[PDB]
Design a protein around this nucleic acid. Structure first.
Length: 153
DNA sequence: GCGAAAGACACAGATTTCTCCTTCGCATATAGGGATGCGAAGGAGAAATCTGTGTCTTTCGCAACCCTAAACC
């Protein structure tokens, strides 16, 4: 809580500067993200953040080996959620296939008790992230199997 | 933010070796005497190499933590 109160001036001074140039800004702990639609406008902000950093909170500094530029032709994600080029949130295809395999193996009764709890928690998180994961699972393995799996334990 | 135990950076100075610098001693092609040219050791005084000391950089298995699942810092 103390860190958020400390960086209030930096947040305020950088937000209204980003608003005037059509740039979106947000911070999570010690991560700062920018995004825009205009080409060749993101190459100037590294000097601006450094100037505001020195002006408002002395002592802090920027790590120069963790800077990333991305577009729609490569992998895009923000703190662990993938962005579809259409503009939809996603969890990833690798995890979708992993959870489908886990449920298929559970239908044959080859899943230990620890993995039941682990997969149940992962499924709950993915359902909160997407919002339609359970419907897809039900339409594939039936409602009875899903209900029995959920009520187990 | 930083234990102990070894390196990097910057500044002195010391020393053996090499190289420049007198002093005279042959020499030899011109019949002895004189002259231009070069070889031999002492005695310098210069220069590359080595060694010395003092100021910081990294980052520990650091009395003192909870026991249900997933993600982020």
């Amino acid at each position: 809580f103390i860190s958020n109160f400390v960086m209030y001036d930096f947040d305020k001074s950088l937000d209204d500067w980003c608003r005037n140039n059509g740039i979106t800004y947000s911070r999570y702990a010690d991560d700062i993200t920018f995004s825009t639609n205009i080409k060749d406008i993101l190459c100037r902000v590294p000097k601006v953040v450094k100037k505001m950093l020195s002006l408002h909170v002395p002592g802090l500094s920027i790590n120069e080996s963790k800077t990333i530029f991305t577009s729609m032709a490569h992998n895009r994600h923000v703190t662990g959620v993938t962005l579809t080029p259409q503009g939809n949130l996603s969890i990833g295809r690798d995890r979708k296939r992993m959870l489908f395999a886990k449920i298929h193996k559970y239908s044959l009764g080859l899943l230990s008790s620890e993995e039941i709890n682990k997969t149940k928690g992962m499924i709950a998180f993915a359902n909160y992230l997407e919002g339609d994961f359970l419907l897809r699972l039900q339409k594939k393995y039936g409602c009875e199997l899903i209900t029995k799996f959920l009520m187990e334990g």
